[PDB]
From a paper:
Here, we present cryo-EM structures of full-length human OCT1 in the inward-open conformation, both ligand-free and drug-bound, indicating the basis for its broad substrate recognition. The overall architecture of OCT1 in our cryo-EM structures resembles the classical MFS transmembrane arrangement of pseudo-symmetric 6 + 6 transmembrane helical (TM) bundles corresponding to the N-terminal (TMs 1–6) and C-terminal (TMs 7–12) lobes. The structures also show a large extracellular domain (ECD) between TMs 1 and 2 unique to the SLC22 family.
The 6 + 6 TM bundles of our OCT1 cryo-EM structures are arranged in an inward-open conformation with the central substrate cavity accessible to the cytoplasm. Our cryo-EM map of OCT1-apo in the inward-open state defines the entire ECD, whereas this region was only partially resolved in the previous outward-open OCT3 and OCT1CS/OCT2CS structures, suggesting that the inward-open state restricts the flexibility of this domain. The core fold of the ECD is stabilized by three disulfide bonds: C50-C121, just after the anti-parallel beta sheet; C62-C102 towards the periphery of the ECD; and C88-C142 between the ECD and the start of TM2. We also observed additional density that likely corresponded to the first glycan sugars on residues N71, N96, and N112. In inward-open OCT1-apo, the complete closure of the extracellular gate was further stabilized by the union of hydrophobic residues from both lobes, shielding these residues from bulk solvent. Simulations of OCT1-apo revealed that residues V37, I365 and L366, which sit in the center of the hydrophobic gate, were within 3 Å of any solvent molecule for only 8.2%, 23.4% and 23.6% of the combined 1500 ns (n = 3 × 500 ns) of simulation time, respectively, suggesting these residues of the predicted hydrophobic gate were tightly packed, preventing extracellular solvent penetration between the N- and C- bundles. We did also observe weak cryo-EM density in the binding site of OCT1-apo at low thresholds (σ < 9). Upon examination of E386 and D474, both residues were engaged in salt-bridge interactions with R439 and K214, respectively, as well as an ordered hydrogen-bonding network with surrounding residues.
Numbering used by the authors: 19 to 279, 331 to 515
């Protein structure tokens, strides 16, 4: 089936675009660079962990790593007479009396590889600019969803798809050669504009060519090709430790695909029943998008062994798919989706209380939440279709699914900023959103 495998290749290659930020933008441990410190450390012979104890401001109470990460002692390390046992001890009764300055010379990053964070110095006061890398992508998705389908209706469908695939490949390759952060953000926007349109076009063609007897099965194979793409990403991110190398490796396969070759907006709100259904479907699409992206970003930000945690988290999407497929036939849709929302809400709630050393439990609860949101996302793709009649379904699917893009725009600032107010607070949001999405589902008909 030559035509099937190539669209499954087009579905697999989408996953690195959505989730690759986990590997391209990791933050290692850092502290200010200081002159003379290296020379003194060589003369006195400090070991690598001892140099910190003598040189970098301590954590103190409540962690407060800020004083080590973003400040330095204004001490004349060129002084020859300093004690090789503890050089600061002569200067004041307590190190807290010393003057602090900012990292005027730069940061020292403890990593053998590299990331956009380490190259553009997206730390301390600039640390909010990492959130804009994912927000620009989701904004591009939002504009693409409204524009590209109309362009494909005005222009020829085949030439349109061929053009947007050539533009997606070329923009993905050029981003690896980005000379600065601005250009990288413009390539990330131009890639966002086309990626999701291509993915939806391929899905449309695959379910249109295939008959109604197998549409659900080919849809589930299309979603499983995304999981295969995630496992390939996981393996390449392991063998290629540099971000530009991984961006090239991820981009080049797309060139091989090229080488192989009336409704009206007012209707959705005109009646209170259709309004109710529309607002509920909008809310569930929003909630599930926010939770799916939020849990992956939280795991990337917080896991201590990201490679195996990402591998085990990805594989669990296979039983989730088979369970959804069987449940659709045996049971229904309202109660299975309520239960799968409630399960992810409860897993997010329990994760607040787990002791940080119970990692072997923490991964189990993370996998249970992942499987829950996977089953719920699979269910809503069916429920969203039959609640709208065919006269409006082509529009109504676009309308309700667009909330996924505003959720993706908002999510990065929640995970990265709000965590600095209090580290539990994002999980409290995810718990409340999931436990409200559980109850609201029961108000839909069946």
């Amino acid at each position: 089936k030559q035509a099937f495998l190539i669209l499954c290749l087009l579905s697999a290659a989408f996953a690195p675009i959505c989730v690759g930020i986990v590997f391209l933008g990791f933050t290692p441990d850092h502290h200010c660079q200081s002159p003379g410190v290296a020379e003194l450390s060589q003369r006195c012979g400090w070991s690598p962990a001892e140099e910190l104890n003598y040189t970098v401001p301590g954590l103190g109470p409540a962690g407060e790593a800020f004083l080590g990460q973003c400040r330095r002692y204004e001490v004349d390390w060129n002084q020859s007479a300093l004690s090789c046992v503890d050089p600061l001890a002569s200067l004041a009764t307590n190190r807290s009396h010393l003057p602090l300055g900012p990292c005027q010379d730069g940061w020292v990053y403890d990593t053998p590889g590299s990331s956009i964070v380490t190259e553009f110095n997206l730390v301390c006061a600039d640390s909010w600019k990492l959130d804009l890398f994912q927000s620009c992508l989701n904004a591009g998705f939002l504009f693409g969803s409204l524009g590209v389908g109309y362009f494909a209706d005005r222009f020829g469908r085949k030439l349109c798809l061929l053009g947007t695939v050539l533009v997606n490949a070329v923009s993905g390759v050029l981003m690896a050669f980005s000379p600065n952060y601005m250009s990288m953000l413009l390539f990330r926007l131009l890639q966002g504009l086309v990626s999701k349109g291509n993915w939806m076009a391929g899905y449309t063609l695959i379910t249109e060519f295939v008959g109604s007897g197998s549409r659900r099965t080919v849809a589930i194979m299309y979603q499983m090709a995304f999981t295969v793409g995630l496992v390939a990403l996981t393996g390449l991110a392991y063998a290629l430790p540099h971000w530009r190398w991984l961006q090239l490796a991820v981009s080049l396969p797309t060139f091989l695909f090229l080488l192989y070759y009336s409704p009206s907006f007012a209707d959705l709100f005109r009646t209170p029943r259709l309004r109710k259904r529309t607002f509920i479907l909008m809310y569930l699409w929003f909630t599930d998008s926010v939770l799916y992206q939020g849990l992956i970003l939280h795991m990337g930000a917080t896991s201590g062994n990201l490679y195996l945690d990402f591998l085990y988290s990805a594989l669990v999407e296979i039983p989730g798919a088979f369970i959804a497929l069987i449940t659709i036939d045996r049971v229904g849709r309202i109660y299975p989706m309520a239960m799968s929302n409630l399960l992810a809400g409860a897993a997010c709630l329990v994760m607040i209380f787990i002791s940080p050393d119970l990692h072997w439990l923490n991964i189990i609860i993370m996998c249970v939440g992942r499987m829950g949101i996977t089953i719920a996302i699979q269910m809503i793709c069916l429920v969203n279709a039959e609640l709208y009649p065919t006269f409006v379904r082509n529009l109504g699917v676009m309308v309700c699914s667009s909330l996924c893009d505003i959720g993706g725009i908002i999510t990065p600032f929640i995970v990265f900023r709000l965590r600095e107010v209090w580290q539990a607070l994002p999980l409290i949001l995810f718990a409340v959103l999931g436990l409200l999405a559980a109850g609201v589902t029961l108000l839909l008909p069946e």
